[PDB]
Amino acid sequence: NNKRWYFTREQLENSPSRRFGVDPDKELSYRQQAANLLQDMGQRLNVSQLTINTAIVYMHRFYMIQSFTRFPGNSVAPAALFLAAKVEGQPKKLEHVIKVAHTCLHPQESLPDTRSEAYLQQVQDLVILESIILQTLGFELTIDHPHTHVVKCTQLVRASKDLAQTSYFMATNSLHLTTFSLQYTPPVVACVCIHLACKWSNWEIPVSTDGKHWWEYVDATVTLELLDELTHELLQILEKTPNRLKRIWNWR
Amino acid sequence: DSVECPFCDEVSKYEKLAKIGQGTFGEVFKARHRKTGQKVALKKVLMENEKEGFPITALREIKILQLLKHENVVNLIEICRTKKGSIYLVFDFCEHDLAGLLSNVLVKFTLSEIKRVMQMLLNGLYYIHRNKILHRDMKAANVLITRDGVLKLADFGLARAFSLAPNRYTNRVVTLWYRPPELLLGERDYGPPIDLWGAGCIMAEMWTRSPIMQGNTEQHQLALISQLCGSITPEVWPNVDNYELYEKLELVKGQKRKVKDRLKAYVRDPYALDLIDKLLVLDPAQRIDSDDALNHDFFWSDPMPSDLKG
Ligand SMILES: CNc1nc(C)c(-c2nc(Nc3cccc(O)c3)ncc2C#N)s1
């Protein structure tokens, strides 16, 4: 139901991986890494950012049941991407996903003769994994991403073309850089992204005719306390990611 | 050295009973939950030919059963694994299927009971369309009835989501006998109206006890349809003359609608006849929709729709 795939902070500490000795700091790294792998591959396979994101969620969720020590990100990522693409009606050929995953993880390696046993095996390997992903997710593959809710909000906040782009930027990055999607509903996360997008650009959106802040019209569970704490967390890790913030920095 | 799996139970929790799915269509079994006796239907996901991982068509159907939750739509309880492996869709079991009853000579319907069936069916249609889903496989056989007389629309294998723009959908969908003119003429920008055409064929089947137009090929099918509904004229069907398959398949044009006349025998009720006639309309644009059908005087005249026992 609504609570299956959402976790408390305490539950996030007790991840299947922490159970096999993986530091919580390390683990987040494994996550970000996969996300990158997903992003890089997704772009070379020329799928939509939507699918890339759907794959990324599958990944985050997978690793709340499975441990990194038993399923390496470089194995799951291609599998999950292959899947998300099928689900988002942008299906990519199995051979073609294998090929791109190879050159991504082995820019140097020589691609095997598709006739090889060692190649035939790695095809079967991907497929096995995609299956292990389905059964992990209990066949729940309909995702919902903050992005939908971004437009809905930004529009109704009447915010410049630019402000709006920064907001989706925040969205796509919260997926690579944080586990917000495992703790907060797409709608709530969207408010977080827009809040920060405003703080970053010195936009302030004035109080409705009622005294009610914009976000309340997007979700009444949300509060300034929360938004402030969350954007701080998100902004911090952005500051950590080389060149990420450069992308939206008002250079003028 | 196997792995965790909290959200996907092994199908072995069910004890198999007896293959319902004849013509090995599906490999569908009846089963009994080992602990509680609860009866279910199991469909295995085939994929003998899938060389592209888990069948994308399975993924679609699953997406759709997950979405649709409604009194007149069959219920997917969960999906099960085997533990080489295989995957099973698990459904609430339904006692009868409409085709089995219509074929059985002992079974008998009153006008009152038939009204009820059509009402539940049309309600189901209203619902899935409200939900942007096209069933695309309307037939007697795909319509189940529970031991307590509730109708369920079943088999979403061929079903698919739809929307608004120009649409480019797969054409060769729906059983031949239950397929509507649009598709046979090569339409790929079709919608909910194709399901209602199906509803029509089924409604009639409620009295004739037998699929009404059984063509051997599309040519033949379209022949039969013209011999029942009249012939396809840009006059009768505005802009029908825009399909390539129109004159490159030309069928005879000395033909006038016998929908009411030819069925007059089997159906007594003037209302039931009028409703059928509004479903079996040539131009999809002019074909009645589920909402108006439910409002048709057929459902609001005597005898009023009744419960199901025999
Ligand atoms: C062939 N397509 C189907 N898939 C399922 C799952 C079917 C099904 N069948 C029943 N019972 C049944 C089937 C055939 C004749 C009859 O008298 C009773 N109950 C539930 C489902 C479902 N879903 S049929």
Kindly report the CATH number assigned to the domain that includes residue A30: 1.10.472.10
Instruction: Identify which of A127, A123, A104 has the alpha carbon closest to the alpha carbon of residue A113.
Output: A123
Helix or strand holding residue A124 (H, E) = helix A117-137
- CA dist B170 to A52, B89, B158, Å? 27, 25, 10
CB of B29 sitting under 6 A from ligand 1: no
CB B45 within 8 A of CB B89: yes
- What is the C-alpha end-to-end distance of chain A, expressed in Å? 48
Copy the structure tokens of residue B260.
């009411």
Instruction: Report yes or no: A66 and B3 within 8 Å, Cβ to Cβ.
Output: yes
Backbone breaks in chain B (C–N > 2.5 Å) follow which residues?
83, 165
Domain boundary among A92, A118, A142: A142
Question: Last residue of a domain, which of A142, A175, A204?
Answer: A142
Please provide the distance, in angstroms rounded to a whole number, between the alpha carbons at the two ends of chain B: 54
Strands B28-33, B14-19: pairing is: antiparallel
Asked if A86 contacts B56 with a C-beta cutoff of 8 angstroms, the reply is yes
Instruction: Please state at what angle helix A94-105 crosses helix A73-87, rounded to 10 degrees.
Output: 140
Range of the domain at A195: 143-252
Radius of gyration of chain B (CA): 21
- Answer for the pair B160, B169: CB distance below 8 angstroms, yes or no: yes
Judge contact between B183 and B222, C-beta under 8 A. no
For residues A79 and A55, what is the distance between their CA atoms, to the nearest angstrom?
9
Domain match, A136 and A177 both: no
Listed in sequence order, the residues at least 6 apart from A85 whose beta carbon sits closer than 8 Å to its beta carbon are: A45, A47, A51, A55, A91, A92, A97
B218, HSE (Cβ side, Cα atoms, 13 Å)? 17
Which CATH number does B96-310 carry?
1.10.510.10
What is the residue type of A111? L
Q: Please, what is the Cα angle at A195 between A192 and A196, to 5 degrees?
A: 90
Q: Are residues A110 and A181 in the same domain?
A: no
Best CA proximity match to B261, nearest among B277, B249, B281: B277
Q: Do residue A88 and residue A165 come from a single domain?
A: no
With a 6 Å cutoff on the Cβ, whether B94 touches ligand 1 is yes
- Asked whether A106 and A122 are in contact (CB, 8 A), the reply is no
How far apart, in whole angstroms, are the C-alpha atoms of residue B63 and residue B68? 9
In a shared domain, residues A58 and A130: yes
For residue A53, give the nearest of A212, A172, A184 by alpha carbon.
A172
Contact criterion met (CB below 8 Å) for A198 and A153: no
Chain A residue set in contact with B, beta carbons under 8 Å = 4, 16, 65-66, 70, 82-83, 86-87, 91, 93-94, 126-127, 130-132, 134-142
Backbone angles phi, psi at A51, to 5 degrees: -55, -50
User: Which one of B5, B7, B66, B82 makes the best mutation probe of the A interface by having the most chain A beta carbons within 10 Å?
Assistant: B7
Q: Select from A201, A203, A205 the least CA-distant residue to A215.
A: A205
Asked which of A107, A142, A177 is the last residue of a domain, the reply is A142
Gap between the Cα atoms of B65 and B86, Å rounded: 19
**A53 and A150 assigned to the same domain:** no
Report the SS3 class of residue A224. helix
Split into its structural domains, chain A has a count of: 2
Mutate to test the interface with A, among B4, B65, B83, B86 (most CBs of A within 10 A): B4
Nearest in space to B137 (alpha carbons), one of B167, B170, B92: B170
Task: For the domain made up of B1-95, give the CATH fold.
Answer: Phosphorylase Kinase; domain 1 (3.30.200)
Closest by CA position to B184, among listed B259, B248, B278: B248
The arrangement of strands across the sheet holding B151-153 comes to B96-97, B143-145, B151-153
3-state secondary structure chain B: CCCCCCCCCEHHHEEEEEECCCCCCCCEEEEEECCCCCEEEEEECCCCCCCCCCCHHHHHHHHHHHHCCCCCECCEEEEEECCCCCEEEEEECCCEEHHHHHHCCCCCCCHHHHHHHHHHHHHHHHHHHHCCEECCCCCHHHEEECCCCCEEECCCCCCEECCCCCCCCCCCCCCHHHCCHHHHCCCCCCCCHHHHHHHHHHHHHHHHCCCCCCCCCHHHHHHHHHHHHCCCCCCCCCCCCCCHHHCCCCCCCCCCCCHHHHHCCCCCCHHHHHHHHHHCCCCCCCCCCHHHHHHCHHHHCCCCCCCCCC
- Domain positions in chain B are 1-95, 96-310
**Do residue A26 and residue A126 come from a single domain?**
yes
- Burial class of A7 by CB neighbour count within 10 A (0 to 12, 13 to 18, 19+): middle
Are A106 and A154 in the same domain? no
Q: Are residues A27 and A99 in the same domain?
A: yes
* Residues of B whose CB is below 8 A from A132: 3
Neighbours of B304 (CB within 10 A): 10
Residue A142 DSSP label: -
Is the C-beta atom of B144 inside 6 A of ligand 1?
yes
